[PDB]
Structure 1
Amino acid sequence: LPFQQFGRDIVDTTDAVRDPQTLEILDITPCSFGGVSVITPGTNTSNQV
């Protein structure tokens, strides 16, 4: 709506914004992340992982 500036999801986290100059609606998504798992055989067998 013309009077609305930001946006929030169900858990009250910003996920949209209006550009101050061009007045465009831009989506915001966090950059990727995750865990790291290492698969190895017995260390007395080899050193490849």
Structure 2
Amino acid sequence: TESNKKFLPFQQFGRDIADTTDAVRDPQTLEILDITPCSFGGVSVITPGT
């Protein structure tokens, strides 16, 4: 997705706390792209006795 961050002219990739890349620079233009995994969330089932 899009991003609102700001890299220095030389820095290429953004690294987060877990040492996994989250901000990438385009190889052919000067823009920054954000990485976020596919939509996720825990599902819980509520039911009375079967």
Unaligned runs of 5+ in 2: 1-7
Moved over 2 A (4+): none
TM-score (norm 2): 0.65
Aligned pair count?
Answer: 43
Give RMSD over aligned pairs.
Answer: 1.9
The structure whose RCO (Cα within 8 Å, separation 6+) is larger is: 2
Unpaired stretches in structure 1, ≥5 consecutive residues: 43-48
TM-score (norm. length: structure 1): 0.66
